[PDB]
Each structure stands twice: as structure tokens, then as C-alpha cells.
Symmetry: D2
Subunit: 324 residues, 4 copies
């Protein structure tokens, strides 16, 4: 623990200026309550939740008997649904996603950032349980109707649905038709997601850069007026570092990319190490662990105290809350 | 009043108490403060374009023709000289504010709602442009979907010409999405709008595409001089609107619009604290609504009960 | 003027070259004593409320009547108002004689159909999705808004507000054919007003085309008064080359047939 | 296959048969497959070398970072070649197509039509739609290099495909009209090709029986899987498989091309 903390401190000390600025911005958004987390399949896989390539390859085994491009990801489930029946599709869905898995530490770190909302394409309930444990209530929206009757100000928006109503394929977006008619089938959910993106600070965690949903979001963001939105933060946790060409392309596309592999060296299959590196960097920056010089000490104290310069006297009891 | 009107009042007041009431204020409320109606601008454009002096499509066409012909400078100058006039804030603006709306969406370019919010001591983050959406300093929005003249009395800051309406979804994606989200997640009351209004019917067309029971029917405060024909009410209520008719609300003249608006506004406000229970069944229903959640607890302190009943 | 004669010369060259298609509207059908649309709108309004129309009302009133009274009443009114033997007015004969490549008509009557049949000029009539795929002829008489060939019902026609709302979804093949014919031929807009809903929709579509990637359609404005200069320039920059019958000749308000006949026969002679 | 060849022969005799020539036919003429040029782009970006997304993205990434000049330079060095027209070109033209629609941006089909004596008003840009001087059309729906080997004249990157309708309204309208008014036979197209699937997505919007189901000539080595065949025939494509039509070698594609084309021609 102490060794890991010291190594994280050294990593922060040798961190690049752009990455430290990104960390500062994310921490400021968290302090302001305007931080939204967009969780992908990486966080779900961190809890060994069934991966989608597995589902697609069982579908392909049923279709052709021998067990995958990105287009295939949507075509194969569609071919199974059409050639086969919806009953077999739903049976596979239930047999595979009808499992109970723990909430890996990345869920805890995501919830510990105090995100205003947690958007996710994951049909699992890991994030819901994680927010239940922490005692903060998130109104879960996974169907069109759920949008209207939202109980709380904080949203847990599963943009692709989930299996709360049942392990049926009409509850989730998995096949090609679901994606083609998503705008027509999920008007309210899509509008809510876009509004949350526009009004909040979005951090993409668990997504590959070439993911379908990320590219769709960037396509939509292209339409927005220049400088009318804040560039979302993209936590990239792929094994190998990010190529400079891809990094520049996707940063010009509208992302501020924090590459986990570029901060901490780890084994090719040590995804949890990279997720933890990024999330722990953010959390410790939140937890004042990385402030060492007296200059940063004065800056932190001033940031906490200066607003109180407007008041004539501050109760000593209040000073406790002033310093959390 | 009629049972359906009382039900609309109850729903509106419950939403206002819960903080989930959004007010969609049209041009009628602004005109209530003598603000120049758009038809005045359209007639001025027609008089400048032709010898002298409008359909719904002409509303957008004549400004568009004047633009294309006489220049953005001329269009802008007409708008500036016609709109750069200070006006007072109506008692109906203050009634709307006193309803405690979560958000106030409006298709008005004036600051009358802005001035009323500033006077009433209500802090709303004003969203009149695309950049304002991300810069919203508060969680309650005063959303001018058609822009305004805060940046300047320019024709590019507001949606007046036909081209502006044609490319609205492309020029105001953030604002349009925000309006649709607020409509979906809130209780919407339309005031100052004609039932055949362009914006109202565009919103109804959008709602047509939603799921059958995935949204709450917006409340439409209709304040035209004559009572709504039963055929029109049937047509528009089947389209997702719950209409509170002011003409049916009270007897009034043909051109006393302030009284018609104030009837509905006051009837809503005074019902804010009204239990709306007269028979014993309603009283017992209200008491059960107050006391049933406490059935989970084994015992309730009597001194606590005062908070249960406010 | 140079403009009028040059436009008519262009029309005649299109006719001679064989790339001429006529977009026939409501005025041409109204000439031969055919109920104007606002007459049916007034009929629906009277049935709805008992007393008597903007562009939006044109669609909404039939839509309101269909929604409340029902589809059966809508179809009954349509039948009793449109089932009638009517004569092919001289403008039909003139347009046919101009040897159009195709006839694209927003009118749901059979007038142009009967004119073609009895005049010897054969067109494959396309008024429904099934027509486009299986049409014997290569030259189409395209009724974009359908007609009553199958039956006097509102489902075969585009009248209500919802019919115009879902036209692209409901008439993909017909709309594609119309736009292709507009792109690949010379369009003469006869029987339409400048502020027409259909004309403005077509101009909206044209606005999205590549700059000077098409030939501006010819708009025959057979209206009572002369066209205002500002309106004329506005609609000429919208991709329309307008030939006005209120400036070509002089007549009174009700001489609509005279305006049509003049603006058509003069072009015919110029060829 | 008998009914499909009967229908194709009927269309050819009547004159209402159109051919959709894909990249496969030009590849037959040793014209580089698209994935080869995608690998070329991927080599100058990351240094060392394919789904549809990457197909459209690698060119897009190179265009964005490297610039327009490098994109056009690679295009010029990659397409400044002359390739003989296959016997497949001649066989396809032997049916006297009403129109020929191809996504290939080469000039193989133009030269084949010239040599065989047929005349098609080749359309490859927007301004060519109005100026066409014939009812016969050769619709190059993805542009051409006739105006020069410039990136903006063709549709081969992600941005081009995304804004195709907004940039090719007339060409898209003409293609859809030709498909609706004719019977279409697809030749040299991947059964899972992006353009073919976009066409199928558009077709699923049309009302049932309002269009002739297009013929898809599949020339892959292995026979089309029964599940894939059933799915893509339900979608609206009548699939004729050359792999199952006659046994063939894996890398000998011309044999299946000729098998299908000559089985259609001899069926005349
Ligand atoms: N062709 C295919 O797409 C395919 C098919 C079957 C299996 N696989 C294998 O599955 C493995 C992982 O899933 P994927 O293929 O969808 O990755 P992916 O590259 O498609 O998804 C990448 C994103 O998901 C996260 N992620 C990926 N793998 C993870 C893992 N094992 N644990 C935790 N987070 C992970 C990463 O954070 C990354 O941002 C890969 O090694 C892949 O080779 C791939
Ligand atoms: N061409 C024109 O439309 C035109 C031009 C000049 C005058 N007028 C007449 O003057 C009045 C202008 O209003 P409109 O026709 O645009 O209404 P409208 O029907 O277009 O607007 C409807 C809404 O505006 C409100 N409203 C209407 N008139 C109002 C007024 N004078 N003061 C405050 N609120 C009002 C109503 O509450 C109603 O909900 C109308 O009575 C109209 O007949 C119309
Ligand atoms: N539409 C209405 O609500 C309304 C109200 C009063 C009068 N009118 C009548 O409408 C006619 C023209 O006005 P509009 O353009 O608004 O009508 P409209 O909506 O019928 O326009 C049809 C177009 O066709 C041509 N046309 C018009 N009347 C014709 C006729 N009798 N025969 C042949 N062609 C004709 C003109 O180009 C006209 O613009 C006049 O006869 C007028 O008496 C209509
Ligand atoms: N996940 C993936 O997508 C994946 C993975 C590994 C390999 N591959 C593919 O293996 C491919 C081998 O070729 P392919 O069959 O997939 O081609 P293809 O996918 O480009 O199919 C193109 C079409 O053109 C025709 N064609 C293909 N090759 C031809 C040739 N040499 N000559 C004439 N016509 C030809 C084919 O019959 C097919 O109709 C590579 O292009 C590569 O993309 C794909």
C-alpha cells in the first residue's frame, strides 16, 4: 500500500502538463458536482461480466457451427434473431447475462468521484449496486418510460437498456436493428444523454477509441457549434500506449485523452492496473495526496478560504465544513 | 369549475410543490405587457417591400423576403428600431414566477421574463444561445429557445425568418435538445400560445414520435376570447395536450386578455395551498396519503406529527 | 423584354431536344370546373363547426375532420365532392401538344389521364408505390399526391396534414422519381402559386442541391395582378424562372383561362 | 437459379436490367482492392499494417493528420495505372444493360463500353446529372478521377460516406430511381459489403412488393452458408452463388465470375 502510494505520487510528479491539467479539470468538476461518468464495457469486464465477443461467438456457433469485426458485432446477433427466432436469442441472453458479479474497485472509485450522473451502455446492474451501497440514490433510467418518472436529480442512464424488466432482447440494444432504430426507439433516452453530455463534464472510462458508441457520440458532437461544448475526457486503458497519430486525430475530434498505458507500465493483460492508475490519480488529486510544496499548500488554503472574505466573521464550527 | 379543470389545477400545483413545473411562455404573455406583436414587424416588412399591408407561412416568408432583398443590415435595423423599447413586467410574469417553476422556456426575444426574474429575486441561468448551455451557472434554466437580443439587437441572434425555423434543429442543437429534455422530464404549462401556433404544433409533431405513454401531456393555458370548439378541443387533447380554457373559465369581453390570463393564473396560485377536499372521502384520502408512509415505522412521536401535516 | 423571350426560347429548345417535363398544379385542373382545394377545406370546416384558409389550415382542417369525424366520413365527403365527369380544358390539350417528356401532377383527378388517353399521347400513370416498380411505359404521368383510381378514399391521396407529414416515409419511390425527373428534365410549373406549399417544398429541396447543378424550373404565374418586383427577384433567386401572365397580357380578375391559354400558346408558337 | 436467370434474361431482352458493378470486378483486372490502399494508408501513419469502420477511418485519419496533399498524392500514385478490361466486363455488357451502376472510381467500365460499341452517359459528379445527354446511364456513385486524382472527387474516407447524401443528392436520387424502375443484378460485391447493406437498409423502407428483388451474384470461394443466404434473401436479395454453382479454386475468382455471367448469357 505504502509502496503503491509512493509510486502514484512519483507518477503524478513526473506526469505531463496536459495530463495534470486534465486531472485538475476533472477534480474541479467533481468538486462542483458537474462531473458525469460515461462507463463502457471495460468497467463491466473488470468484474468478469460476460464480454460481447463471447455472446457474438456463441451466436455464430449456433448460426454456422464454428466459433469478429465491429460490423459483425451487430450483424451476427441480427442474423441469429432473423434466421432463428427471438426465443433462442432471448434464451442465450438469459443464460449468459443471468449472473451475479461483484462491483470491482473501479466502480467504487467512479462513485467516489461524486459524479452528477453515470451514463452507461452496460446492461448489467453493477453500477446500480455500487451506488446503492454508497448510500447515494441514483434514479435508474433504462427504458423510455423511466425518463418521465425520474425520482431524483442524479441519473443512472443506461442508454442501451438493461434486463430489469427481464432478460429479453427487446429490453436492450444489441443487434443491428436496435442500433439502426435507436433514435426512433429511444428518443427520450438519447435526448437525455445528449443533454447530460452538453451540460456536464463527461469522462469516458471503459471504452475503446474506435468503439461504435464513441464514434456516434463524436459524430453528433461534430454538429455542435464550435466551442459550444466542453471536450469530454476519455480514459484510455488499452494495453499498449496510444499512437501519436491516433491521439492527435481523436483529440481534434473532440476528446481529451488520458492514456493509462502512457502513465504506468503494466502487463498486456493487466487492465485493472491501468484503470486503477487513472482512477487513483484522480481520487488522490481529489484527496490532497499530491500537494507537497508550500506553494500548493497556500493555493489550496486560499481556494478554500477566499470566498469567506466576503463575510465579516466565520464561526469556528463552520471552519470545519469549510475544510471538509 | 369542471372536474377536468380541477384535475389539471391539482396536477399543476403538485408539480409546482415538487419543483417539477416548467412554464412554456409564448408571445401572448409578452404582448400582455404591450410588447410589439410579431404581426406588427411582418406588416412593417410588407409595407417596406410593397406599397402597403398575415398567414402562418407569411409570418416566416415576409421577413425572409425582406432579408434576401433589402439586406441583413435593413432587416436588423427594422428589428432594432421596433424592439429596442423598454416595457414593464406584467402581473402575469410575477404570477408565473410565484408558481415556482423549475424552468421557464420561452419563445420570446424580450427580457420581460428576465426582468421579472431579476425583480422577483429569482436566479435563473439565461440560455439564449448555443454557448450558454455549457456555461449555465445554475441548475434552473430560463431557456429562450428562439434566442434574444442580449448580445445585440441583430437578426442573427433570434429566430424570426423562415430560414431560421428551417435550420433551427441544425443551428440550435444544444438548445433544442435541452428544451426537449426539459419537456420530457418536467410538467409543462403553455401560456401565451395559440393552439394553432407554429411552435406548439412543431412540439406536438415531435411528441407524436414518442412512446405511447412515455411522456406527460403538457398543460395548455388557452386564453383566446371565445371558448374552444368541442371539435378543436377533441383534436388537440388527443394530440397530447390538456387544455385549460380561460374563456370557459370566466365570462369576459373580446379584447380584455389580461383578465383572461389573470383568471387562470390566480385560480392556479390560490389553489397552491388548497387541499381541494370537500367531501369526507377526499379528506380521508388526503389523510391516508399523509399517514400511509408512516405505517412502516413501529411508532411515531406525536410531536413529530406536526411536520407530517406541515 | 429580353428575359421573357429568352426563357421562352429555353423552353422551346427543351421541347425540341425532348427534355421537357410539365409539373401541373391546381390552377390547370380548376380551369375545367374542378373543385379548388379550399372549397373542400371549407366543406370540412362547415361539417366540423358549421361556418367558414392559411397554408396550415389547409392541412389541419381536413386532419381535424379525419381525426374526429372519422375516415369513413372523410372518404364520403371526398367521393361526393370529387366523383364527377369533368371536361378536359384546352390547357390539357396545349400541354399535351407541347410533347412533354413526363407529366408530374399534384392533382389527384383523372383530367390529364383522360386528356392523354383521348389525345393519343400515352403515359404510364404512376400514382402509388406499386406503379413505380411495374410501369410498362418509360414516360411517366406522375401523380405525386396520388389519385382515386383504386377508390375515392383519402388513403390513396395526399390531403391531410399527416399525409404531408409522412409523405417521404409513405411515398419514397414517388418522391425519388419526382426529384430525379426534376433533375434530369426541364420543369414547367403550371397551375401553382408562388406561395404554394408544394412549390416551396420543392424550392427547399432545390436549396440543398449543389450550386448551379440544375436547370431552374419554369414557373407559369397565371395570377390576376402583376408580380411585385421584390417577390419576383426573391423567387427567381430560389431557382425559379417565372413567366407571368399578368405582365404578358392584360385581362381582368376572372380571365384565368385566358392567362393559361396565352402563356401556353405563345410558348407553343415560339417553338 | 433457373427463375433468376429467366428474370435476368427477360430484363435484358426488354431492356429493364441494370448491373451493380462492385470493387470485385475491377480487382479482377488487378485494380488494387480497397483494403490494399487502406493498408497503404495505415503504413504511413503507424508504420506497419479490416472492418468497415477501419476501412473508412484509416483514410480519414491520414487525411486529417497528414493532410489533403498527402492523401491526393497517395491516390495519384495508387490509381495512375492502366488495366485491361476483364472478360467479365464484356460479359456484363453483353446483356445490353439499361444502366450500369458501379462504386468503382476507375475508368475500366467506360473503356469497356467504348470498345464494345455501347454508349452510356457516364455520371460521376453532381453537375454531370443535368448535362447527361442520354437515357442510358453509367452511374459512378462514388465519384471518379476524370477531373483528376483528387481526394475531393471520390468517396473513399469516413467523411465522404457520412456526408454522401448531403454532397451527392442528385446521384443518390438517380441511383435509387434506377434501382426502383429496373431489375438490379449485383456483381463483384461483398455480401456483407457496406454499400450493399446501406442499399438493403434503404430498401427495407419501401413497401413490400413495390420493388423487384435485386439479384446478388456471390462469387466467394466457399458456398454461401444457408443461414446467411436465408437472412440476405429475407432482406430482399435473391442470391445466386457461383461457389455452389460450380466447384472452383480458392484464388480463382474469374472462373466463378465467368460461370455466373455465361450461365446468364447462354440462358438468353
Ligand atoms: N475481434 C474481437 O473483437 C474479439 C472477439 C473475441 C474476443 N476478443 C478479445 O477480447 C478481449 C477484450 O475484449 P474486447 O475484445 O471487446 O476489447 P476491445 O478492444 O474490443 O475493447 C477495448 C476497451 O475495453 C476495455 N477492455 C478490453 N478488454 C478488457 C478486459 N479483458 N478486461 C477489462 N477491460 C477490458 C479496455 O479498457 C478498452 O478501453 C480482447 O483481448 C480481444 O482480443 C476480441
Ligand atoms: N395578421 C395578424 O395576425 C394581425 C395583425 C394585426 C392585428 N391582428 C389582431 O390583433 C390581435 C393580435 O393577436 P394575434 O392574432 O397574433 O393572436 P394569436 O392568435 O396569433 O396569438 C394567440 C395567443 O396570443 C394571445 N393574445 C392574442 N392577442 C393578444 C393581445 N392583444 N394581448 C395579449 N395577448 C394576446 C392569446 O392569449 C393567445 O393565446 C389578434 O386579435 C389579431 O386578430 C392580427
Ligand atoms: N384560398 C382561399 O381561401 C380563397 C379565399 C378567397 C378567394 N379565393 C379564390 O382563390 C382564387 C385564387 O387565389 P389563390 O391563388 O389563393 O387560390 P388557390 O389557392 O386556388 O390558388 C390556385 C392557383 O391556381 C390558379 N388559379 C386560381 N384560381 C383559378 C381558377 N378559378 N381557375 C384556374 N386557375 C386558377 C392561380 O395560379 C392560383 O394561384 C380566386 O379565384 C379567389 O376567388 C380563395
Ligand atoms: N474481420 C475481418 O473483416 C477480416 C479478418 C481477416 C481477413 N479479412 C479479409 O480477407 C480478405 C480476402 O479477400 P475477401 O474475399 O474478404 O474480399 P472482400 O471481402 O473484399 O470481398 C470483395 C468481393 O470481391 C470479390 N473478390 C474478392 N477477392 C477477389 C479477387 N482476388 N479477385 C476478384 N474478385 C475478388 C469477392 O468475391 C467479393 O465479392 C481481405 O480483403 C481481408 O479484408 C477480413
Amino acid at each position: 500500500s505504502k509502496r503503491y502510494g509512493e509510486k502514484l505520487k512519483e507518477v503524478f510528479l513526473m506526469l505531463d502538463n496536459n495530463v495534470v491539467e486534465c486531472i485538475k479539470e476533472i477534480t474541479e468538476s467533481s468538486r462542483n458536482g458537474k462531473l458525469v461518468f460515461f462507463v463502457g464495457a471495460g468497467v463491466s469486464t473488470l468484474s468478469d461480466y460476460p464480454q460481447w465477443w463471447r455472446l457474438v461467438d456463441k451466436y455464430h456457433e449456433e448460426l454456422y457451427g464454428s466459433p469478429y469485426s465491429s460490423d459483425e458485432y451487430l450483424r451476427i446477433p441480427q442474423i441469429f434473431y432473423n434466421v432463428k427466432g427471438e426465443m433462442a436469442f432471448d434464451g442465450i441472453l438469459k443464460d449468459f447475462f443471468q449472473v451475479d458479479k461483484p462491483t470491482n474497485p473501479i466502480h467504487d472509485k467512479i462513485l467516489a468521484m461524486n459524479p452528477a450522473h453515470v451514463i452507461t451502455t452496460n446492461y448489467d446492474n453493477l453500477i446500480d449496486t455500487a451506488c446503492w451501497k454508497r448510500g447515494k440514490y441514483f434514479s435508474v433510467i433504462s427504458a423510455e418510460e423511466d425518463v418521465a418518472n425520474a425520482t431524483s436529480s442524479r441519473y443512472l442512464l443506461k442508454v442501451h437498456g438493461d434486463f430489469r424488466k427481464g432478460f429479453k432482447g427487446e429490453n436492450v440494444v444489441l443487434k443491428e436493428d436496435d442500433y439502426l432504430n435507436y433514435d426512433q426507439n429511444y428518443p427520450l433516452i438519447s435526448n437525455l444523454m445528449k443533454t447530460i453530455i452538453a451540460t456536464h463534464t463527461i469522462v469516458f472510462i471503459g471504452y475503446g477509441l474506435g468503439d461504435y458508441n464513441i464514434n456516434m457520440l463524436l459524430n453528433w458532437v461534430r454538429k455542435l457549434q464550435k466551442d459550444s461544448f466542453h471536450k469530454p475526457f476519455f480514459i484510455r486503458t488499452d494495453p499498449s500506449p496510444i499512437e501519436n497519430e491516433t491521439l492527435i486525430y481523436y483529440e481534434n475530434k473532440g476528446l481529451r485523452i488520458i492514456d493509462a498505458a502512457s502513465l504506468i507500465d503494466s502487463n498486456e493483460y493487466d487492465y485493472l492496473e491501468r484503470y486503477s492508475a487513472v482512477m487513483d490519480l484522480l481520487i488522490e488529486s481529489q484527496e490532497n495526496k499530491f500537494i507537497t510544496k508550500d506553494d500548493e499548500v497556500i493555493d489550496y488554503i486560499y481556494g478554500k478560504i477566499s470566498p469567506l472574505f466576503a463575510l465579516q466573521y466565520i464561526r469556528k464550527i463552520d471552519l470545519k465544513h469549510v475544510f471538509e
